[PDB]
Amino acid sequence: HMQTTSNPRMQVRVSLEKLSLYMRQSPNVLTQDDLPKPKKWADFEIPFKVEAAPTPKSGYIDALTFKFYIAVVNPDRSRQYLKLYKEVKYVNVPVGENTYASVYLSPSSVKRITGVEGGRGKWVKYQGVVVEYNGKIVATYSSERGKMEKWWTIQSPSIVETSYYPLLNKDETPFSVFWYDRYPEIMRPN
Amino acid sequence: MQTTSNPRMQVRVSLEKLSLYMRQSPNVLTQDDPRPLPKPKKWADFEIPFKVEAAPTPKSGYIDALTFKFYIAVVNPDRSRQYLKLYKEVKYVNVPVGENTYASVYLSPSSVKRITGVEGGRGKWVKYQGVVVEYNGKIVATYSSERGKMEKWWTIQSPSIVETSYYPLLNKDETPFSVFWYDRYPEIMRPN
Amino acid sequence: HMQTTSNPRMQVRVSLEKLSLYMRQSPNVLTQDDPKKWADFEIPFKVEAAPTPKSGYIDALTFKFYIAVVNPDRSRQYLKLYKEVKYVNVPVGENTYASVYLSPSSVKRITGVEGGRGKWVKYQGVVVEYNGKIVATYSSERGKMEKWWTIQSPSIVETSYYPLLNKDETPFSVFWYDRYPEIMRP
Ligand SMILES: [Cl-]
Ligand SMILES: [Cl-]
Ligand SMILES: [Cl-]
Ligand SMILES: [Cl-]
Ligand SMILES: [Cl-]
C-alpha cells in the first residue's frame, strides 16, 4: 500500500547541494573475545532539504526516491566508461531539516577501478543525483553543466551501464552499525 | 515449502500479550571511534512471549516454521480523523517446542517521532494491537488488545482505518538489534 | 546488466580446496552500556585468468553449496540444503575463501545439542560457475557419488528449511572482511 498517507494535494520541493566523495575506513567493531587493517570505502554524500505546500502536520513526508549515477573509467577496457546506478528510497523524510543522502562503493570496487586500496587520482569522472517524489522529478544535481548536464541519459558506445561494481546503500555496508540522525530511514527491499 | 516433518503433526501456540518497549539502539564500540560519536535514539520494540506445543511431539524438538502477523493501529499524524493500520509478517524457522521464547517487530525512531511528534514517543500512541500466528497456513493463535466485537479489529473494513506500507514495521534482522539478544527469539526466515 | 565488463576473450580457472566445517561463537560485540555455536563452512580457493585482466579482478563468481544431513524428524531420510552465493570483484592470483553458514538452532535441531555432536554433515559439495558455466567442483565423494546432489532418490529430499546463510546474513557480516570477496546483494 504505497499511496500517500498525507494530504493528496501536497507538493514537495527539494533543495540539493553537491555529491561529494569521502574515503572512510570500515569500522573495526570491538568484541569481548578480543585486528585487521581497515580498508577504505567510497562514501558519496549529498546534502538536501525538503519543504512542502502545505506542510505535513507530522513534519515528515512518506518517502523520497534518490537515483545515483556514477561514471568511472573501465579498468579492464581503457577506452570505455562504466555507468553505475543505484536507487535509494528513503522513508519518513523530515521537512525543513538539513538532511543527507548517501551511496557507497566497496573497498574492492575502489581498488579494482583505481589499482590501489583507497583509490588515486580523480577516478570519479561523472556524477549525478536525481530526486523523485511520487514518481516526479523534483531535483537534479550533476557534475556537468549545460548540454552535458544529464549525461546519464546520453546513449553512447563509449559508456555502458553495469550491475558489477555495485553501488550500495548504507544498510548494505558496515556503516549500518552507525545510526546518525542526518540520514533518513531506508526502505527495505519489498 | 513442504514440511520436513510429520505432515499430520498439529501445533498449538500459547501467546501472552504484545508489549511495547522503547529501547535505545545498541551503541557499538569501535577501534577508532567516529567524531562525532553516534547518539542512538529510542526504537519501538513490540515484544510478545509465546510457547509452542505439538501433537505428536517432533523428534527433533522443533517445528519447521511459524508465521507471525502483526497489526498495529495508530492515529494518522497527518490526518487525525483516521487511523493507520501497520502490518508485518515475520516467518520464524526452527521454532523449539516446549520452550518459552519471544516474537517481535519494530518501528524506527523516525516512525515514532513522526507518529507522536516527539522523539521517544508520548502518550498512548498505540491505539490497537493484534498478533495472529499461523502454522502451515492455518491460524493457531490470536492475541488482541481489544475484546468483544472489536477483537479482530484488523478485519474491519472502514474508511477511518487505512492500511499503509509507510511507517514500516521491521523485523529484528531489519534493525540494529539484529545480532543482539540472539537467544531470546527464533531465527527469522530471510526474504525469498 | 550482467554482461562481462572484462576482455570478452578471457578464460577463468578456479582451484578449490576442500569445504570444512568450523563451529564458531557469534561475536560478542562490545557496546557503550555493557563491555551459541554457528556452523561456518569454509572453502579456500584461488582464481587464475588468461589473459590476466588489467584490473586484477574478475566481475563475479557464483558458488553453489550443497550440504546433506540426516533428517532429525525421520531417521531414514537425508535433507539436502542448497545455497547460491554470488561474489563480486574476485581477485586474480590470490588465495581467498568462500563460506556458507547454518544457524545455532539449525545445528541444535539437526544434532540434538548446541554446538553439534557426531559427524552430522553426511555429504558436501561446492560448484563454482563463471559466466554461467561450471569452472570447478568439490565433493566429499568420488566416483558415482561425486555429484551426489544430482541424484534423484526418495531417501534424500531438498528443503528450504534449515536455511543456509551467506556471511552477510549472519552476525559475522562485518568481521574478517579481508578473508572473503564481496557478496552481491539480492
Ligand atoms: Cl555540497
Ligand atoms: Cl568529491
Ligand atoms: Cl504479557
Ligand atoms: Cl506495554
Ligand atoms: Cl570439517
In chain C, the domains with their CATH numbers are: 11-27+36-170 (2.60.40)
DSSP C62: E
Q: Per this entry, what is the length of chain C? A: 186
In angstroms, rounded to a whole number, what is the distance separating the alpha carbons of residues C88 and C71? 34
Cell of B138: 492455518
Chain C positions touching B178 (Cβ under 8 A) are 171
Cell of C14: 578456479
Strands A11-16 and A60-73: unpaired
Q: Do B111 and A185 touch (CB under 8 A)?
A: yes
**C33 CB contacts (<8 Å, ≥6 apart)?**
B26, B27
Tell me the residue type at C47.
V
**What are the DSSP E strand ranges found in B62-155?**
62-75, 83-96, 101-107, 128-135, 138-144
Residue A137 and residue A150 in contact, taking contact as beta carbons nearer than 8 Å: no
Asked if B5 is an interface residue toward chain C (Cβ–Cβ < 8 A), one would say yes
Question: Nearest CA to CA, how far is C121 from chain B (Å)?
Answer: 16
Q: Count Cβ atoms below 10 Å from residue C143 Cβ, excluding itself.
A: 6
Strands B161-163 and B83-96: parallel
Residue B77 and residue A58 in contact, taking contact as beta carbons nearer than 8 Å: yes
Q: What kind and span of H or E run contains C108? A: helix C104-111
**B149 CB contacts (<8 Å, ≥6 apart)?**
none
Nearest to B103 by CA among B92, B113, B87, B93: B92
The technique by which this structure was obtained is X-ray
Residue A73 and residue A157 in contact, taking contact as beta carbons nearer than 8 Å: no
Cα radius of gyration (chain A): 18
The angstrom resolution of this structure is 1.8
Q: Do B4 and C109 touch (CB under 8 A)?
A: no
Under 8 Å CB pairs connecting chains A and C tally to 89
Q: What kind and span of H or E run contains B53? A: strand B42-55
Q: Smallest Cβ distance to C28: which of A33, A76, A161?
A: A33
Q: Do C159 and B60 touch (CB under 8 A)?
A: no
